[PDB]
Ligand binder design. Structure first.
Ligand SMILES: Cc1cc(C)nc(N)n1
Ligand SMILES: Cc1cc(C)nc(N)n1
Lengths: 264, 265
C-alpha cells in the first residue's frame, strides 16, 4: 500500500484468500470489514501515528468507533484483487469520520463503499468529551479540507436513526462468547466480531437465498473478554432486519443495527 | 505465489496484518495455521486440482486431515514479510503428507515449520479408505520422488502417540459453538478453529508469560455447525507441556486430542 499523490488518502490492494470466502465463493462481509480496518491502520502508520496523535498520547485519549456503515454491490471472488481507498476527515467537535471505496483491480469499478463515525473517550475512564486545541490541528493536515464523502447523497442510509428492537425478537442466537482470535493486540474484542454476532441471528435460509447489501451498526458498549452476548433479530420489510446485541445477564445493550438483503 | 523451478513445491510471501497479531505484536498460531492452509490451496490450484484429482471426483473421495504438527521458532511481527514453502508427498497406501517451511523474508532464516498427515474419505458416507493405485499415480508427478521431510529427525515429536486426557481435567473451556466465520466454503468447520478451541482451555497467565513452541493435533471426528465443544487441558511437565482433548458437550464424543509445548519469555 501507499499514500496518493496529494497524501490526503491511502490505497492498498488485497488478494482474496481461500479461508476468507463463504459458500458462494465470494468474500464474507467480515473479511471486507477486516480489510477496511487493515487499510485504515496502514494509512495511520504512513502518516506518523501508532491510532493516536501527540496530544492524544500525553493525555489518555483514544479513538473509538461509534457507527459503521457498509454498502456492498459486488463481493470479490476467491482469488480476485480488490483495491480499497481510505481517508480521514474532521466532523467538528463531534469527532472524526473515515470513508472507504472498494474497487475491482481488473474492471476498475466500485464494488462497495463504507463510512464510520469516531469519538474521543478517555482510555482510563471511558468518557466521551471533545477538544479543539492541538488535536484538531494535528490531523487536519492529513485530511482533505473540502468535503469528500463516500455517501454524499442528501438523506442517505448512513445517517438514519436506528430504533431499539422490541421484545420478543423474531430470531435469536444466545450464548455467544468471544475467544482469543476475536480479541485484538490490546485484548479488546475486535469491532468485526460484533458484525459476525449480529448476523448470527439471521436465518440460514435468508443467507442461502439472499446477499447482504447494506449493514449499519451503532456501537453503544464494549463486550469484554469474560462477557456473553445475545444476538436478537426482527424482520421489518428486498429484506430488512432490526438487530440488537445485549449481555446475556443484565440485558445491557452493547450494539444495535439494520441489514438489507437482495434476492439472488 | 508460484511453483519452484522443478515444480515439485510452491512458494508464497505474506505481509503480517494488524488483525492477525496477539498481545505481543506477533502473528498468532491460528494466523500461521491459516497461511499454511492458504499456501497449500494455491499449490493445489497451480498444479490442476480443486484438492481432488480426476479419479477422486469420480469415486466421491476427498482428502481429510488426520494430524497437524506445527513448531515455531520465531513468530513474525505485525508488518513483516514471511515466505512459506510447501510440498506434497506420498506415504504409501496410508495417504499423503504435506510439509511447510516458514522463512523470514529479510533475514532468510527458518522461523517455523509444519507437517500434516492426510487420509482418503468417502465424501458421502465419511468412511476412511486406503489410497488406491490409480489415484497414487495421478499426484506422484507433483511430488518429489526422494524423501523430503520438514521434520527428518530420528525421534521427532511429529510422530509421537498422543494419549487420551483422563478425567477430571486440570483446566477447561465449556460451551464452544462455531459461528459462520469458523465455517469454510463447503459449510464445514475450518481445521484452524480446532487449534483455537484447544488453546481456549490454556490459562491466560500461561499465555501472557510463555510462547507456544510446538503444537501437535490429532483429528478423530469433525464438529458440525450445530454442535457444542468442551475443551479440556492437563499439565504434564522452564518448559511447560499440556495434554488436550476436544469433545462434544452432550454425549462426550471425542473429536480431537493433542499436546502443546511452551517456553518462558
Ligand atoms: C460511542 C461509544 C462506542 C463504544 C464502543 N463504547 C462507548 N462507550 N461509546
Ligand atoms: C482422520 C479423520 C479426521 C476427521 C476430521 N474425521 C474423521 N472421521 N477422520
Amino acid at each position: 500500500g501507499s499514500l496518493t499523490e496529494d497524501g490526503l488518502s491511502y490505497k492498498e490492494k488485497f488478494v482474496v484468500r481461500s479461508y476468507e470466502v463463504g459458500s458462494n465463493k465470494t468474500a464474507t462481509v467480515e473479511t471486507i470489514a477486516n480489510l477496511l480496518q487493515e487499510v485504515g491502520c496502514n494509512h495511520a502508520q504512513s502518516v506518523g501515528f501508532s491510532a493516536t496523535t501527540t496530544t492524544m498520547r500525553k493525555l489518555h485519549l483514544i479513538w473509538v468507533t461509534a457507527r459503521m456503515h457498509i454498502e456492498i454491490y459486488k463481493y470479490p471472488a476467491w482469488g480476485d484483487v480488490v483495491e480499497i481507498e481510505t481517508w480521514c476527515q474532521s466532523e467538528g467537535r463531534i469527532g472524526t469520520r473515515r470513508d472507504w471505496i472498494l474497487k475491482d483491480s481488473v474492471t476498475g469499478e466500485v464494488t462497495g463503499r463504507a463510512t464510520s463515525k469516531w469519538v474521543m473517550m478517555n482510555q482510563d475512564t471511558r468518557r466521551l468529551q471533545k477538544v479543539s486545541d492541538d488535536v484538531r490541528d494535528e490531523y487536519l493536515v492529513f485530511c482533505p479540507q473540502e468535503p469528500r464523502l463516500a455517501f454524499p447523497e442528501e438523506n442517505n442510509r448512513s445517517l438514519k436513526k436506528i430504533p431499539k428492537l422490541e421484545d420478543p425478537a423474531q430470531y435469536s442466537m444466545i450464548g455467544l462468547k468471544p475467544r482469543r482470535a476475536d480479541l485484538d493486540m490490546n485484548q479488546h474484542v475486535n469491532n468485526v466480531t460484533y458484525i459476525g454476532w449480529v448476523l448470527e441471528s439471521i436465518p440460514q435460509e435468508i443467507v442461502d437465498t439472499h446477499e447482504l447489501q447494506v449493514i449499519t451498526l451503532d456501537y453503544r458498549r464494549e463486550c469484554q473478554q469474560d462477557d456473553v452476548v445475545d444476538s436478537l433479530t426482527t424482520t421489518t420489510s428486498d429484506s430488512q432486519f432490526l438487530h440488537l446485541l445485549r449481555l446475556s445477564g443484565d440485558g445491557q445493550e452493547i450494539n444495535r443495527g439494520t441489514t438489507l438483503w437482495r434476492k439472488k
